[PDB]
Structures are given as structure tokens and as C-alpha cells.
């Protein structure tokens, strides 16, 4: 028998002690080797109540990724409310690696396997595991990248959908390549997406969203206000910071039939996603900077009000990167033996 509980977890990885890539350096000294013989356990004829919006695994992954980025990235200058330190800012190697989250002694993780689970309801076929799967800690905005795909249907996740201050996550059946590239002025880059693929996927997402909002019509709009990391799709490709204008992806007129290319830019000064302050980087490296990623999640915020109108609008971007972890951690739940 088990009860719900919260305890300190630890992490597991396949990191190399000799690598200079920054995630491997963090993961050899913060994590242990992956379970050499893992095996899951069915919990026959048992039901449990998962709730992906109050999971402490998420807070712990947040603190972990913060520590990793705090030691890992080397800006020339870091400014944090009056204080500003200046340090050597060498280039770094950077490519996220999958991380598992293991329970300590006297606890175990439960796994919701209901193919179309929405993160909050009860669960049919519950499993017991030692660790999570390999979760890649990739901070990004608007788009969720290099994650996992929904088993059967596209799934729409929120705390309530009738609250507009609470983020909504959409999990796709089918990943869509975003092929970002800076070719061999030095900051202008561009992200490319197969327009036919992406627009079919977006029509399917519209159909689901109409399913949950009373058949009502829905439309997409660019983000309304705030700093660049919200208004545009921001991410990190090999130490450089990409900012891409995503408006051509949320193109209602074309629910385009070829290649969409987003104007991306590499930025020298950024605001740290840890809420901390702003940091200055060194000019980008030379050569072809490539980044082929899977789009396997979107985050939306619904325009408040307009309960009068016969349509609902949705803009990309949802709060702070903690929820990205939810995107993968939704199906787990640590309990006390």
C-alpha cells in the first residue's frame, strides 16, 4: 500500500566524464548512470489520480535545469539588479541529453498509461517504475521541441480551459521538423518548416480546440506584449540564442502549401529565463550553425473576455519554462511505500 508523498529525487543519465559538452559535464557530477536493468511493473486492477499541475517532480526539474544553466553558460557580463559581474566568456559545446528522474529508498514512481490521458483525471493501467524516461531539458518558448508524442489522439491539457490566466499545452500525434540554420549579417538565420505538414497539423489542433470549446470557431494571433523571449520563439542552438518570428505558423488564412521560413536572429544580450537579470554573450561562431528539431508540443494562452463573442483566439507562449517539464512529466506520480 502507498500514499501520496513528496521527497527529494535524484537524476540518472548516460553522460561522459571526458566530454566538454556542457550537459554531460553537469550530468556526470549531478546524476548517476542510468539503471543498468530497468523493468516496469503492472498494477493490475488499480486506479490512481494523477495531477500534472501539482507535481513536485516538476519543481525539482526546474531547480535542476536552473543549476545546470547557472554553471554552464558563460556570458561576458551578467547584470542582476544593480550587481553586474564580468567573467571570461568562452564558447561552449551544447546539446541536451536525456535525463531520468529516480526515486530514493522507500518511494516509487507511478506511471499513467491511459493512451489519451489529459494529466488530471484518474488512470486505468497504472505502472510502477524506478525512474522516469529520458527527459531532455530543452528550454524554449511557444514551441516544445525534442520531446515525446501523444500515443493516439492529439491531447489538450490545462488546469481549467475556462480560466484564461492558466496555460494550455497541446501534445501532437505527429512531430513536425523545424530545420533552423545560420549559413556560412552574421546573426541573421532562418528556421524552416514543411508548410503542408504544419498546416494540416494546425487544422487538426483547431478541430480539437473546437471540440472542447462548444464547437465554437477559433483563431490564432501573435503574442500581444512583453519581451522578445515571449513574443518570438526563442531557443539555444550550440551556445547561440535564436529568436524566430513565428507568425507565419499561426496563419488562419491558410488552415501556403510548401515551405515556411521564419526570420530568426542570433542575439548578443538576452534576459535570463531564470528571472534573474540580463546577460551579454560573445559574437557567434563561424560556419553552418544547424539545428534540426522535432516540434512535439505547443503552448497557448487564450484571450480573456470574449465569452460574448462566437469565437476564441489563441496566442503562442505560456508563462515560464517550468511548464515545459510538465509536457513530459505529466504522466508520473511519486508515492510512499
Amino acid at each position: 500500500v502507498w500514499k501520496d508523498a513528496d521527497t527529494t529525487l535524484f537524476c540518472a543519465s548516460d553522460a561522459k566524464a571526458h566530454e566538454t559538452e556542457v550537459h554531460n559535464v553537469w550530468a556526470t557530477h549531478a546524476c548517476v548512470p542510468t539503471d543498468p536493468n530497468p523493468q516496469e511493473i503492472h498494477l493490475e486492477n488499480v486506479t490512481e489520480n494523477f495531477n500534472m499541475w501539482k507535481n513536485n517532480m516538476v519543481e525539482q526539474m526546474q531547480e535542476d535545469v536552473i543549476s545546470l544553466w547557472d554553471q554552464s553558460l558563460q556570458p561576458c557580463v551578467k547584470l542582476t539588479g544593480g550587481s553586474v559581474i564580468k567573467q571570461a566568456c568562452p564558447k561552449i559545446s551544447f546539446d541536451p541529453i536525456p535525463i531520468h528522474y529516480c526515486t530514493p529508498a522507500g518511494y516509487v514512481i507511478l506511471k499513467c498509461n491511459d493512451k489519451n490521458f489529459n494529466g488530471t483525471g484518474p488512470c486505468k493501467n497504472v505502472s510502477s517504475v524506478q525512474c522516469t524516461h529520458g527527459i531532455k531539458p530543452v528550454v524554449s518558448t511557444q514551441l516544445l521541441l525534442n520531446g515525446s508524442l501523444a500515443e493516439e489522439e492529439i491531447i489538450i491539457r490545462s488546469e481549467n480551459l475556462t480560466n484564461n490566466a492558466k496555460t494550455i499545452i497541446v501534445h501532437l500525434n505527429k512531430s513536425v521538423e523545424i530545420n533552423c540554420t545560420r549559413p556560412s549579417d552574421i546573426r541573421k538565420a532562418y528556421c524552416e518548416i514543411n508548410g503542408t505538414k504544419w498546416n494540416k497539423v494546425l487544422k487538426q489542433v483547431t478541430e480539437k480546440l473546437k471540440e472542447h470549446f462548444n464547437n465554437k470557431t477559433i483563431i490564432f494571433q501573435p503574442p500581444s506584449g512583453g519581451d522578445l523571449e515571449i513574443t518570438m520563439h526563442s531557443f539555444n542552438c550550440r551556445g547561440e540564442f535564436f529568436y524566430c518570428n513565428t507568425t507565419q505558423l499561426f496563419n488562419n488564412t491558410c488552415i501556403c502549401n510548401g515551405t515556411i521560413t521564419l526570420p530568426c536572429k542570433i542575439k548578443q544580450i538576452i534576459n535570463m529565463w531564470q528571472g534573474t537579470g540580463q546577460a551579454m554573450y560573445a559574437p557567434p561562431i563561424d560556419g553552418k550553425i544547424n539545428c534540426v528539431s522535432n516540434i512535439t508540443g505547443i503552448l497557448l494562452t487564450r484571450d480573456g473576455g470574449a465569452n460574448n463573442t462566437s469565437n476564441e483566439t489563441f496566442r503562442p507562449g505560456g508563462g515560464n519554462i517550468k511548464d515545459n517539464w510538465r509536457s513530459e512529466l505529466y504522466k508520473y506520480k511519486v508515492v510512499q511505500i
Epitope: 481549467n160 475556462t162 480560466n163 484564461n164 490566466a165 492558466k166 503574442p223 500581444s224 506584449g225 512583453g226 519581451d227 523571449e229 515571449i230 534576459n271 528571472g275 494562452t301 480573456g304 473576455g305 465569452n307 507562449g317 508563462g319 515560464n320 517550468k322
Partner: antibody, heavy 127, light 98 residues
Amino acid sequence: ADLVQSGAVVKKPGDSVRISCEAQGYRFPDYIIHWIRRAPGQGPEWMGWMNPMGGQVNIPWKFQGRVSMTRDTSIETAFLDLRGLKSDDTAVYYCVRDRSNGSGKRFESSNWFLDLWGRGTAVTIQS
Amino acid sequence: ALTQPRSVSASPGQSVTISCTGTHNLVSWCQHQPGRAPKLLIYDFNKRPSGVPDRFSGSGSGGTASLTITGLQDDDDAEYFCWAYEAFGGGTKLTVLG
């Protein structure tokens, strides 16, 4: 712990107004901030919420373009901006702190949790 | 957006009930003394925070929500407002009849 609002003012039609909200006694970066409106002879009217971490805003159609909710985490102050004032904009505006939403340990409220309230700033449109 | 009557009144010791009609979402309540900063009283129908007395309470189901203040005092004379997300009540002036 309170939200200090700026003093009352008068304006002319058209025109535009800026109002502050200096947060005190808590972590301004966490918990979003709603701006609400009370006009003479009408019930309270919400104008939008603003996440002070990144500055993201959620604003209903009635006020698109005409309003902007900004902030300056350096001195923990929110800001409301209204352009092109008419008569129906004459009102008292409050900044208010939600605490069931944002980053940080939220309060646990399924509805909106309007914890902390400013004292109000009156703008009068003297046409 | 949400109805709410305009006036309540009672005398230093009895009990009153303000209500908010509208639609079936959860409602929180707020007291607003003349010109002061409003104060959260009770949230999510019946739940009550801390710093606020047991006399204030509430509930709700069927379309309308109720907020009750028992054992009134000469400092409860203020306006009261309710909300369900961004649907707002018009307000209710509470008069303590002297």
C-alpha cells in the same frame, strides 16, 4: 506588503495617461497583475492581466491597441497605459495582485485570487 | 456580467446575505471600505483565507452564489463585490442602520 498607486489626475479627450503601481513587501516578479476599472455609475470592469516575469499580457478586445500593461522589475513597479481617452474612460483604476497564477508558489485557488489591492488612481476626462 | 443586488442593510448584531447571480462558475468576494484598498473575504464559494473572521462565509450552486456576514459591526459598512474569473458583480452597498 501592498501595491502603492500613483496620484489622481485630469486629462483631455484624445490624450493618453500612464499610471504606476509600486509593489512592496513581496516578490514582484511572481504572481501576475490585473488592472481593473470602476467608472461612475457602472460595475467593475477588468482590463487585462500582466505577467511581470516576462511582461506577457492578456487583454480583451474592448481594449486592444489602446492599452498596454508594462512593468520594470528593477524597481518592482507595474504600469498601465491608456491612449486616446474619451468620456467613457473617466474612471478609477486599480492594479491588483493575483496570487493563484504566475511563477512562484501560487495560493491554491481554482478561481482568481485577488489577494492584494491598490488604493486606486482617478483619471478624469475634462472635455 | 454578474447581477448582484445594490443594497443590504441590518443593525449591529444580526446577519445579512448578499448574493451574486450570473452563471455556474465559482465566485470570490471582496470588501471595499470608502476609498480604501479592497480586501479579499472568501474565495471558491465557501473557502475563507486567514486574517478574516468566521462570521463571513458563503456558498453557491444553481446559478447564484451567497455571501453571508453574521454578527455585524459598525465597521462592515462598505461595498461588496464578487467575481468569477473576469465576470464581475455590480456591487452591493452594505448599510449599518444607525
